[PDB]
């Protein structure tokens, strides 16, 4: 019974400037946990489908960086400990989405980005020919 | 430095040398806790933090940050030293056992009641 009687909508403004057109965003998320990347992929896919954005998903091959250290302290060169870091990748390829949609979706999926997961988003931006390039000087 | 510090347990393990070549087969110092008499929020500067080391409300009003006077801090240090000395004396002294047939013999020495049985049996 204590539901709010009336909520306030966030202020949304429409600017006369034409919106930026994005042909393709490649959200490449890197992590140490395959299950975390799978859950984040499920989240992003569901959010994009609910927002009506064309999204494909693929998995770039993982990277494993290994190094070796002396096991003992003074002298046991023959004996070593090998450590590794696994960087697993998940690429979400979103296509044909506008600038405002890209901004809101990126904010939504970056605020909910899990700890230990890094994101590298590449935005292919469609542009028209410059004014001075149509004809010579 | 600061990052070279360790925990109390590790330092005591290193200092007491409970294990090693000497202690492996028998080929004096004892652990003492430094946190039994130490209260959170007490420092050599004698500050009074509302809610941590002093009551949060005085006369029904929210206390503010206060610093004990030099004489008051001396009194607090004296009280701490007195408590430490009393605890050390209590630990050093013991309730003397009742000797058996002789002072160094084990015979006649009571061991107390046997351990209670599992199926609700007490001795």
């Amino acid at each position: 019974v204590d539901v709010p009687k009336d909520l306030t909508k966030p202020v949304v403004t429409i600017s006369d400037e034409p919106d930026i057109l994005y042909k393709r965003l490649s959200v490449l998320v890197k992590g140490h946990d395959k299950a975390v990347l799978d859950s984040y992929e499920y989240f992003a896919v569901l959010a994009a489908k609910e927002l009506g954005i064309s999204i494909k998903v693929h998995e770039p091959p993982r990277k494993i960086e290994r190094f070796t250290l002396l096991q003992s302290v003074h002298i046991y060169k023959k004996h070593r400990v090998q450590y590794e870091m696994r960087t697993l990748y998940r690429c979400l390829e979103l296509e044909h989405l506008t600038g405002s949609t890209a901004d809101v979706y990126l904010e939504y999926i970056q605020r909910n980005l899990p700890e230990g997961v890094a994101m590298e988003v590449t935005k292919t931006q469609l542009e028209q020919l410059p004014e001075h390039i149509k004809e010579p000087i | 430095s600061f990052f070279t510090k360790l925990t109390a347990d590790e330092l005591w393990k290193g200092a007491l040398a409970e294990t090693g070549a000497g202690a492996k087969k028998g080929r004096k110092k004892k652990r003492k806790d430094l946190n039994r008499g130490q209260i959170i929020g007490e420092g050599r500067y004698g500050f009074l933090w509302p809610g941590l080391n002093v009551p949060l409300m005085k006369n029904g009003a929210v206390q503010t940050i206060a610093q004990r006077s030099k004489e008051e801090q001396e009194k607090v240090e004296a009280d701490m030293i007195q408590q430490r000395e009393e605890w050390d004396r209590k630990k050093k002294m013991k309730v003397k056992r009742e000797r058996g047939w002789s002072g160094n013999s084990w015979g006649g020495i009571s061991l107390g009641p046997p351990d209670p049985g599992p199926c609700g049996e007490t001795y």
Binding site: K30, G116 | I40
Partner: protein
């Protein structure tokens, strides 16, 4: 014999938590990392800064909560947000716990210039995974 981050069985009386009971070769297999940040990933920078900050945070929370932390801290980094999740005993009074939470959060936020938060999960006693 390997002496690194292992608890040696002597009489089956020493209680150990889940973290202590597992040797390092189990980190990827049975006990996740106590800290989670992107610094150690491929192509990411500032790994050393994150490591130093994590070490300082651990050594600072250990001394700020003397005899209260049940187990090792869990440090999470999300953007510029830092979250310290600590399992704490119920020995201390809640007033002191809240005072320490506020003090530690404010001091760490001002020291590291990031919005630090501290979540405490209270347990009646140190959880014993097994005895060694």
């Amino acid at each position: 014999k390997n002496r690194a981050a292992r608890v040696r069985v002597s009489k089956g009386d020493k209680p150990v938590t889940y973290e202590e009971a597992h040797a390092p070769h189990y980190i990827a297999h049975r006990k996740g990392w106590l800290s989670l940040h992107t610094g150690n990933l491929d192509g990411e920078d500032h790994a050393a800064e994150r490591t130093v900050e994590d070490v300082f945070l651990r050594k600072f929370m250990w001394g700020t909560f003397p005899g209260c932390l049940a187990d090792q801290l869990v440090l999470k980094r999300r953007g510029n947000q830092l979250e310290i999740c600590a399992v704490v005993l119920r020995q201390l009074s809640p007033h002191k716990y809240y005072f320490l939470v506020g003090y530690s959060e404010t001091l760490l936020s001002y020291f590291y210039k990031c919005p630090v938060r501290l979540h405490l999960q209270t347990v009646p006693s140190k959880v014993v995974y097994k005895y060694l």
